């Protein structure tokens, strides 16, 4: 190669990064902000060798900044995609900032993208469970990441796969785990809106054609104090509308109008609309009677507030 041009073009690069090199030097002890500016700049040029370098340089003085591990580890996963490299960086992020679940959840997805053995993915998740997290929400997030992983291992085409039982076993295990360990340490349930149960219900009703299990799960979701939410009933209604019958929609909606506390008017319009498009004239009239009754009491209570 003709050096001097390699020497000259290398000098142009040196001049180009030079303002950044000086700002980094004049700045504070972690100069993290200055590192971010440098990282942003290096990402615009898009040279893989320099991006790793700059990241690595920043992680030397800021190894405890989870947002920095995420950007770095996510970058490898979006651009480079080298197994040995991406997995090494995820593993390094967890050990420096174990308290953040994203580092763990992103680790498990990345292990999945790169066809890591089920046994090795599984043992990592178990470590995540013993990791120390700060919010109850954090524990549902890790479980959800693992459950999705188990779901993607299932061939739903088949009526009875083992992987499906592994998924179902994990689900049972996850809800009991959320109820006892997370509630115990935090003294609040970690899943107020039962999003795990919701996911299980959706899977069990759409993918495994199991509507009875879906219903018991939704009943349990409503039992946990979710019956007062309009949108919550609508989630159940929408699940039944797709894989259940019309008969079950009507009773649910009849139940929904009665229990809803935030936006009862919303569920009433939705009930009336169904009867209009699918119900008999008698089915419609009953709907109008029940909606009138519920709505009369609600406006009455609004009136009570005012009187009282």
């Amino acid at each position: 190669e003709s050096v001097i041009q390699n020497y000259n073009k290398a000098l142009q690069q040196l001049e180009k990064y030079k303002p950044y090199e000086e700002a980094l030097l004049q700045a504070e002890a972690p100069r993290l902000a200055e590192y971010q500016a440098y990282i942003d700049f290096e990402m615009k040029i898009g040279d893989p060798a320099r991006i790793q370098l700059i990241f690595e340089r920043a992680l030397v003085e800021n190894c405890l900044v989870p947002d920095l591990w995420i950007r770095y580890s996510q970058y490898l996963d979006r651009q480079l995609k080298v197994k040995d490299l991406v997995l090494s960086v995820h593993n390094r992020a967890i050990r420096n900032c174990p308290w953040t679940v994203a580092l763990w959840s992103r680790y498990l997805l990345a292990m999945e993208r790169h066809g890591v053995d089920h046994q090795v993915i599984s043992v990592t998740f178990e470590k995540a469970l013993n990791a120390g997290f700060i919010q109850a929400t954090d524990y549902v997030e890790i479980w959800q990441a693992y459950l999705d992983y188990l779901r993607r291992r299932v061939d739903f085409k088949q009526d009875s796969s083992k992987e499906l039982e592994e998924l179902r076993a994990a689900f049972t295990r996850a809800l009991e785990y959320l109820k006892q360990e997370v509630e115990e340490r935090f003294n609040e349930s970690g899943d107020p809106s039962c999003v795990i149960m919701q996911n299980w219900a959706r899977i069990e009703a759409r993918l495994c054609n199991n509507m009875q299990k879906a219903r018991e799960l939704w009943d349990s979701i409503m039992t946990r104090g979710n019956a007062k939410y309009a949108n919550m009933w609508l989630e159940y209604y929408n699940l039944e509308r797709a894989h259940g019958d019309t008969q079950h929609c009507r009773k649910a909606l009849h139940r929904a109008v009665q229990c809803t506390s935030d936006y009862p008017e919303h569920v009433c319009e939705v009930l009336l609309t169904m009867e209009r498009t699918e119900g008999s004239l008698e089915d419609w009239d009953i709907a109008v009677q029940k909606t009138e009754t519920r709505l009369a009491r609600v406006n009455e209570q609004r009136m009570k507030a005012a009187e009282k």
């Binding site: 083992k162 009875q212 219903r215 939704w218 009943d219 409503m222 039992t223 159940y236 139940r255």
Partner: protein, 206 residues
């Protein structure tokens, strides 16, 4: 008596049997059943030993499930997918005929009923709780009677009337003091015990 793949092909369509009301269902020890599962390799993933005799289930044995062996009354805290495994009617008769049962035992039939506070759903009724019953005159005396979920309060009322020497002519009121401090009063004499939502083993007193 027929081949292992005859048996496996026959009970294959037991799965589709959705739980239905007025439905007759039974109890089988999971331990026995899992052995049978392995024996006919019902689960596609596990069929290594096939119908090799060491894996032979033999006569059905559910002795472990019962509390008192003589009375054949079942144990408490029995779960669905761990300690036992439910089974449709014809699936029993077939599995009866093929393997028989341990002498001194009778089939554990139970039937599904509609329960669920908010979202209604089907599940095999079991472990119904002897509901505590009592009288207005005697606060100490408490009876514990079994009540199906499909059973209406009227049925419940009738049973209350029979055991406290009360005839038909005089009226009655029924009330439920459940986790509410205050004493409610039951109104409907048509609905089930489920839409009322009464809790297990609790004093419903007349």
């Amino acid at each position: 008596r027929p081949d292992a793949e005859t048996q496996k092909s026959e009970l294959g369509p037991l799965m589709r049997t959705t739980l239905q009301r007025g439905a007759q269902w039974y109890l089988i020890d999971s331990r026995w059943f899992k052995q049978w599962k392995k024996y006919v390799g019902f689960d596609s993933w596990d069929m290594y030993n096939v119908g090799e005799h060491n894996l032979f289930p033999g006569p059905i044995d559910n002795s472990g499930l019962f509390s008192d062996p003589e009375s054949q009354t079942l144990k408490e805290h029995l779960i669905d997918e761990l300690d036992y495994v439910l089974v449709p009617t014809e699936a029993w008769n077939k599995l009866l005929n093929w393997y028989g049962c341990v002498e001194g035992q009778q089939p554990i039939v139970r039937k599904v009923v509609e329960h669920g506070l908010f979202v209604k759903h089907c599940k095999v009724e079991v472990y119904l709780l002897e509901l505590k019953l009592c009288e207005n005159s005697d606060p100490t005396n408490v009876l514990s009677c079994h009540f199906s979920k499909a059973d209406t309060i009227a049925t419940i009322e009738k049973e209350m009337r029979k055991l406290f020497n009360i005839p038909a002519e005089r009226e009655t009121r029924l009330w439920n003091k459940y986790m509410s401090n205050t004493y409610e009063q039951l109104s409907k004499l048509d609905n089930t015990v489920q839409d009322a939502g009464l809790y297990q083993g609790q004093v419903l007193v007349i």
